[PDB]
Amino acid sequence: QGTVNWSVEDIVKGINSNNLESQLQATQAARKLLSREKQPPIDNIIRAGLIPKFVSFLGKTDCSPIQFESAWALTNIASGTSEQTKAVVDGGAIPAFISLLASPHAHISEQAVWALGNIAGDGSAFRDLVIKHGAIDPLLALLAVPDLSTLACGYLRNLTWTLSNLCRNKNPAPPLDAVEQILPTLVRLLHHNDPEVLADSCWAISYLTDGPNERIEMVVKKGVVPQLVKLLGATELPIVTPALRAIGNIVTGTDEQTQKVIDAGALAVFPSLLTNPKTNIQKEATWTMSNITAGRQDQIQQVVNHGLVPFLVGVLSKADFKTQKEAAWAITNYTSGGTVEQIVYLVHCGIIEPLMNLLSAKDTKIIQVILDAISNIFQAAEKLGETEKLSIMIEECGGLDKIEALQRHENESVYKASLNLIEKYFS
Amino acid sequence: AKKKLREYQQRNSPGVPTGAKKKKKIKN
């Protein structure tokens, strides 16, 4: 009841009082104001001029509670808009929080970890500014223990989450040397058994692999792909989501980097991923499939062997409409790279009729994707004479009507493929 | 050719999941 709902005016009167204990009470009252869930008055606290005082209290080494209270208060200002985070940074909080990482009070260090996570989380400029102030070495030193299990769960989760914000954004991506510094302890967190540490470690890896191939390689050469594939089969949705995002990012790289994903056994998880009831998992799993079917013929062959072509036929036949696109892409890239035997196998699995059904959509971009795929399929059946059988399939499922109704379309690409298709195979 | 996650999520996000960008502390 002592510090429950102070007015900002009372907080200001206490913080300006020349009594350190009065300032502590006012700072705790500020922290409780900033901790309530119904619209905490961050902007009023900023306008009263309290941030420099809070930042100054961070250095009060012989009053450890006012360090904690102002650290917590600043953490929650930094949790708001970019403008509010910037107010914390402009008060000089970054070097003061980094000095607090080494505190003998675990709860104070943890709070400095958290506040730096919020600042780094605002974006790449503050992320790189936290890095330039030297935050990475003291953060990583806090994880330099023989066994992470001796650390308190919340502490470890907070360190993992803040390291992942140092890995996060993309224009620009984090400094190469900082990524190299963090990765080894990140690999270690990826083997820790706590669902939240694992999820945030997968998020970090997902950020690091979202870029050019040299960035994927930094991660892939640390050996994490098998562990990512294991995490891909977790029952915790907060784990599979970033695990799948990372795997999907890695298979956007070279054929060789894609192959490590396949070597690691990832394709065996896809029967359940391509039927997963969370539509986002199923969308991203199908996108990931479309970058594997863009690979080599031996890689397309592995998709066949794992029985994933009926699963693509399934997603094409019935799924979220955005997911059906990814499946259309998966098919068209398959048709682009595959052998003739692999391509006619699509027809044997029933690809034709769900492709024709999707010609009824309005998104111009897929009529392209789809008509390309049937162009490639006709072209590969032609090398075995099976052009007629395919033309009657497309005719019997009402796909012929779609293809020819389509050369009155508002696109050069649509109706030159439409009308091309008709002359060699429908006359 | 392969489509990176930015081309992926160009015709998909907003709505694509990510970790927590910022975190408010409400309890001890």
Author numbering:
A (entry chain C): 71 to 497
B (entry chain A): 13 to 40
Can you quote the paper on this entry?
GM130, a non-nuclear Golgi peripheral membrane protein, has been shown to bear an NLS-like sequence, allowing it to interact with Importin-α13. Since both Importin-α and p115 bind to the GM130 N-terminus and Importin-α pulldown by GM130 is enriched during mitosis, we hypothesize that binding of Importin-α to GM130 during mitosis may suppress the p115 and GM130 interaction, contributing to Golgi disassembly. Our data describe a molecular mechanism whereby Importin-α modulates mitotic Golgi morphology via a Ran pathway-independent interaction with GM130.
Moreover, crystal structures of Importin-α with recombinant GM130 either carrying a phosphomimetic residue or a phosphate moiety and molecular dynamic (MD) simulations show that the phosphate moiety indirectly enhances the affinity of Importin-α for GM130 by extending the intermolecular interaction network. Superimposition of GM130-NLS WT and the S25D and phospho-S25 peptides in complex with Importin-α revealed good structural overlay. Interestingly, apart from increased intermolecular interactions in the minor NLS-binding site, we identified intra-molecular interactions involving S25D and phosphoserine in the crystal structures: Asp-25 interacts with Gln-21 via water molecules, whereas the phosphoserine phosphate interacts with the Arg-18 and Gln-21 side-chains. Most likely due to different crystallographic packing environments, the GM130-NLS phospho-S25 complex lacked crystal contacts from symmetry-related molecules and displayed a relatively greater B-factor, particularly in the central α-helix. However, the highly dynamic α-helix shown in the GM130-NLS phospho-S25 complex indicates that the central α-helix contributes little to binding between Importin-α and GM130 compared to major and minor sites, and few hydrogen bonds are found between the central α-helix and Importin-α. When bound to Importin-α, the S25 phosphate enables water-mediated intramolecular interactions with backbone amides of nearby residues. Thus, S25 phosphorylation seems to destabilize the free peptide and stabilize the bound form, leading to a slightly higher binding affinity for Importin-α relative to that of the unphosphorylated GM130-NLS peptide. Moreover, the phosphate moiety on GM130 does not directly enhance the binding affinity between GM130 and Importin-α. Instead, our crystal structures of Importin-α in complex with either a phosphomimetic or phosphorylated GM130 peptide revealed increasing numbers of contacts with the minor NLS-binding site of Importin-α and additional intramolecular interactions within GM130.
